[PDB]
Design a protein around this ligand. Structure first.
Ligand SMILES: [Co+2]
Ligand SMILES: [Co+2]
Ligand SMILES: [K+]
Length: 304
């Protein structure tokens, strides 16, 4: 395999971390291949679930807990810390909140969160590599509590970073927020990508096309599929009660992605940097509720 950039995996990985049996587990947690039968049963369907008052409360709780865990991860970002150490802290933080770390064994993913550094677009596997001054790193968190999944991610600066890194991360965050500001009943899901690409392209960046936002509630990933690029064929119209994520992945160079031999790590084919931000949203009557928002601080960690 020919690596696209300077990053390399740092093995070996620690044995998979166990989750106490008292914590409720999603169906794929015990499947030998980590398959989710509930999700597969809906593969190919574009119908979007309309959440009940009970479902909404469940989503509000898990998303609040997920934010708490991402904040724990944020507090550990500093030169020298390895992504595996971040993952260990995340794992314990989920357990402390009586939640199962959704990524764990999802289709056999080996860790409890995704850590994506520099050229890694998404799904980076926490390993033995110490973060380096100048790196940008995204930590993607998803928790499962009482049958509901809550998902979010933020990109962080490791120590001091260059101007290119600041522009990329800032622009990516703006892309997500401009998309969120457009969410409300009546809007076509395919419209979000037009908004996102417009801002990214205006700043000389590209939009990853192989990964999209997704419905989320009792299932980790389900309808609707939400592309982040312009002129996509996303199916569906927003309606009060819909819950889904927007998680734009923006790149310094081209949008092309490829996967590492580990089967998960997605990287830019040109080896340039990528950044991402994600929130889980609930469509209301007026607009939308950002379920994974910070409640005690006005801005994301990179500008705090
Ligand atoms: Co997501
Ligand atoms: Co996520
Ligand atoms: K990255």
């Amino acid at each position: 395999y020919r690596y696209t950039g300077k990053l390399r995996p740092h093995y070996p990985l620690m044995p998979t971390r166990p989750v106490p049996s008292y914590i409720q587990r999603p169906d794929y947690a015990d499947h030998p291949l980590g398959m989710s039968e509930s999700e597969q049963a809906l593969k190919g369907t574009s119908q979007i679930k309309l959440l009940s008052s009970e479902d909404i409360e469940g989503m509000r709780l898990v998303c609040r807990l997920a934010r708490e865990v991402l904040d724990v991860a944020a507090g550990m970002i500093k030169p020298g810390v390895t992504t595996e150490e971040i993952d260990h802290a995340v794992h314990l933080a989920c357990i402390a909140r009586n939640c199962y770390p959704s990524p764990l064994n999802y289709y056999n993913f080996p860790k409890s969160c995704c850590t994506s550094v520099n050229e890694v677009i998404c799904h980076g596997i926490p390993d033995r590599r110490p973060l380096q001054e100048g790196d940008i790193v995204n930590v993607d968190i998803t928790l499962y509590r009482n049958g509901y999944h809550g998902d979010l991610n933020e990109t962080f600066f490791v120590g001091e970073v260059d101007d290119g890194a600041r522009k990329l991360v800032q622009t990516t965050y703006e892309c997500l927020m401009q998309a969120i500001d457009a969410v409300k009943p009546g809007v076509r899901y395919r419209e979000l990508g037009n908004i996102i690409q417009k801002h990214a392209q205006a700043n000389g960046f590209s939009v990853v096309r192989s990964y999209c936002g997704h419905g989320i509630h009792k299932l980790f990933h389900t309808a609707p599929n939400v592309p982040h690029y312009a002129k996509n064929k996303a199916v569906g119209v927003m309606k009060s009660g819909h819950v889904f994520t927007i998680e734009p992945m923006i790149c310094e160079g081209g949008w092309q992605d490829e996967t590492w031999p580990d089967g998960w790590t997605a990287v830019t084919r040109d080896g340039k940097r990528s950044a991402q931000f994600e929130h889980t949203l609930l469509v209301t009557d007026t607009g939308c509720e950002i379920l994974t928002r910070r409640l005690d601080s006005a801005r994301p960690h990179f500008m705090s």
